[PDB]
Structure formats: C-alpha cells, structure tokens
Write a protein that binds this ligand. Structure first.
Ligand SMILES: CN1C(=O)[C@]2(CC(C)(C)Oc3ccc(-c4cccc(Cl)c4)cc32)N=C1N
Ligand code: NI
Ligand code: NI
Length: 402
C-alpha cells in the first residue's frame, strides 16, 4: 500500500498533459512521455522537429529491431506517422523492470507536438482494440504485464495548479503520480469506489445521473453516455455531449449570474479575472456525476468543484489578477472525463478486475467550505440501462477477429 519510488513521478505544464520519464533502447535514452489513457500506441518522436530538443535515435540502440511496417494516425487537427519497431523500455521512477515493447518511431507529424510542453512522445494506456494500425499491435501495458510479474493495474493521481502562481511568463507546473502495479494509500482519503469498465477499448464507463449544485438535470440517462463515456488522462477538459453541455452551462450560468461573463468565456475562448485571492468560488456550483456501481441498482457519485473546472491561467498583462478558463466543453463523441475530473480524484485503472476506482485525492484543490467528494452507495430500484449502442458500420462488422 506504499510505492514511494513512483509517487510524484509525473510532471507537465497546465493544459499540456501529464508526462512520465521513460527510457528507450540500449543504452537507455530518456524521453518525457505523455500519459494517455485515451489511446493505445507507444509513439515517440524519432526525427528532428522544431518543438523537440531530443528524440529517439534508433541507430544508437543495440537492441532496436525494425518491424518493417509503417503506421499513419490522422485525427481532427492533424496526424502523426512513422515506422514500427521494438526495443527495450523502462520507467526509471516506476517498477524495477525492463520490457521489450512496440515503439512507433514518429518521423513526420502535423499539430502533434506542442511548443513548451516538454514531452517527446505518448504512452497509450488503453486497450488493443483501438491500437493503430490494428489490434495486433500489442500496447505497452499489455507487454509489461505479460513479460513481468507486475499486477495488471495502474493508478493515477493528477494534481492540478492553483493561485498564487510562481511565474507570469510560463504556464503553471503540474505534478502527479502514476503507480504502476498498485495502489498507494497516501494518495487518497476516505472510500475507494469502483465503476465497471463497460468494454475494453477506451476506458469506457456508464454515467447514470448528473447533478449541478444538487439539482438533477433530469435527462434520459443514455444522453449522458451518447455515444460513450470515457476516462481520459489525455484530455484536459470535462467534455460533455451537446445536449448535456447546454443543460450544464445553463445551470452554471444561473448559479453564477451575479457575474456577467462574455460569451467567449463559456466557449472556453476567453479568460475571466478577479483581484488576487478574491475569486468568488461560492457562486459557482458543484458538479456530481453518478457512476454505475459494481452492484446492480447501485451507483456512487464523484463531485467536483469550480476549483477543478475553472483552470488557472496567469496573464502576463494582468499578473496581479487571478484569471481562469472555463474547462467544460461540448463534445460530439461522448463524455470525456479529462483532467477536470481526474484532478479531483485518485483514479485506479483496475484492468485485472475490469473496473475503475475513484477516491478523493490527497492533492485536490479545494477551500474551507467545500471538497471534491466520492460518495455512495445510491440505490435505484429497477435502474435503467444508460448505455448507448454505437450503430454498427459494415466496415467494422466485416472485420474478422481470429
Ligand atoms: C483526446 N486525445 C487526443 O487528442 C490524443 C490523440 C493522440 C493521437 C494520442 O495524440 C494526442 C497528442 C497530444 C494530446 C494532448 C495534448 C495536450 C494536452 C493533453 Cl491532456 C493531451 C492528446 C492526443 N490523445 C487523446 N486522449
Ligand atoms: Ni532521472
Ligand atoms: Ni477470417
């Protein structure tokens, strides 16, 4: 219940992801790698790029093997692509093991790397189903478990920033822990509650109820999971399906109505500020997501504060003020529980038992009046099915799974 060596092994800049130090090759080449529960490839910069100080040099590794197959991964704003291979991989502030893993050597990319983020690659921690080019490319965590005696579980404590801030010219530093193979009891307090992983592709879960400041949104619960709900350390915001987003914003606007913010604020495109230390936290409501319990007809709730959904961004021009970005945003691809959710909680990705645990994080930002909370059970007699079934395309139906 104590993993001192892996506590505080995450770093990053606010809004630019949390990364862990990894080594690749023989002798070990250190890179900073974004921890991403929303994808399933281990992919690292492997050629010069303007935003990289360093990259994986395959020619310098005696243990590198080329798989003689390329990989191309487009997404909304751009792409990464490169060459598949295997090499020896370790996590210096992780388990004392070295594994041979698939590595996608990124040779070309567009709007992938971010100036100043300080990471050079991505560690996709989700399941094989969503790996590229296909599900036969074994993800890193699968290789780790198979090759070692590391328990099939990892846990994440993402610790977000708060005012006062150290620097005006750079983004706020963030920290956290990725405990590989276990649960560290110093990272949480109170009860640890589990929700089932609905299906092993993304870390998919089911939300059964949503409340804003104690008030039920009263929507068909399938709307909350349209077309999926996932836990994603590779997303900054809490992202909500259109209908849910609009309902949530209406409620948050109403509660906070003493303050008249520009439309740009609610779109996440503009900061709002108060004089240092005077932020009226109490005018902003708590948000509770009720997640399906392990027991039929049970749920538990995770509750977050405005300290989680209003992200601190220090303004060079107004460094005397505390300024915030609204970090709840609209989705067309379902609910995404990103850093806005995860920074409230210690989150246990219990792959062995097909479940995700939540407990109050020992590092969450709060005040003297309210705390992020994990509470249950809530019993609902004859609880409905809140899961959505994504329409099956012919292309996906046509795949064989041998
Ligand atoms: C949603 N999501 C992505 O778009 C993605 C997809 C992938 C192809 C792995 O590329 C990236 C790259 C950077 C970030 C990023 C960039 C800045 C901050 C953060 Cl948290 C992540 C997120 C992703 N992984 C995700 N989970
Ligand atoms: Ni080191
Ligand atoms: Ni076949």
């Amino acid at each position: 219940g104590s993993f001192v060596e892996m506590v505080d092994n995450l770093r990053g800049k606010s809004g630019q992801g949390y990364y862990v130090e990894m080594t690749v090759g023989s002798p070990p080449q250190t890179l900073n790698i974004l921890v991403d529960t929303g994808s399933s490839n281990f992919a690292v910069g492997a050629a010069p790029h303007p935003f990289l100080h360093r990259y994986y040099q395959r020619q310098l590794s005696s243990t590198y093997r080329d798989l003689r197959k390329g990989v191309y991964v487009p997404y909304t704003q751009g792409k990464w692509e490169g060459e598949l291979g295997t090499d020896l991989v370790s996590i210096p502030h992780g388990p004392n093991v070295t594994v041979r893993a698939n590595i996608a050597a990124i040779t070309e990319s567009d709007k992938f790397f971010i100036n100043g983020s300080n990471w050079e690659g991505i560690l996709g921690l989700a399941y094989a189903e969503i790996a590229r080019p296909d599900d036969s490319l074994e993800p890193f965590f699968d290789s780790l478990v198979k090759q070692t005696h590391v328990p099939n579980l990892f846990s994440l404590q993402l610790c977000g920033a708060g005012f006062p801030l150290n620097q005006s010219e750079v983004l706020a530093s963030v920290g956290g822990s990725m405990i590989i193979g276990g649960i560290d009891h110093s990272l949480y307090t109170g009860s640890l509650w589990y929700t089932p992983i609905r299906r092993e592709w993304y870390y998919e879960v089911i939300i059964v109820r949503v409340e804003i400041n104690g008030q039920d949104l009263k929507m068909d619960c399938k709307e909350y999971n349209y077309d999926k709900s996932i836990v994603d350390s590779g997303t900054t915001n809490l992202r909500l399906p259109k209908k849910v987003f609009e309902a949530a914003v209406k409620s948050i606007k109403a509660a906070s109505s003493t303050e008249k913010f520009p439309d740009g604020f609610w779109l996440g495109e503009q900061l709002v500020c108060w004089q240092a230390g005077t932020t009226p936290w109490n005018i902003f409501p708590v948000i509770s997501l009720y997640l399906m319990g392990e027991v039929t007809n049970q749920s538990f709730r995770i509750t977050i504060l405005p300290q989680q959904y209003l992200r601190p961004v220090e303004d060079v021009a107004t460094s005397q003020d505390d300024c915030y970005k609204f970090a709840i945003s609209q989705s067309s691809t379902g609910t995404v529980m990103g850093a806005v959710i995860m920074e409230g909680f210690y989150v246990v990705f219990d792959r062995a038992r097909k479940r995700i645990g939540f407990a109050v994080s020992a590092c969450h930002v709060h005040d003297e009046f309210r705390t992020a909370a994990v509470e249950g059970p809530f019993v609902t007699l004859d609880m409905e099915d809140c899961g959505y079934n994504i329409p099956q395309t012919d292309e996906s139906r046509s795949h064989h799974h041998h």
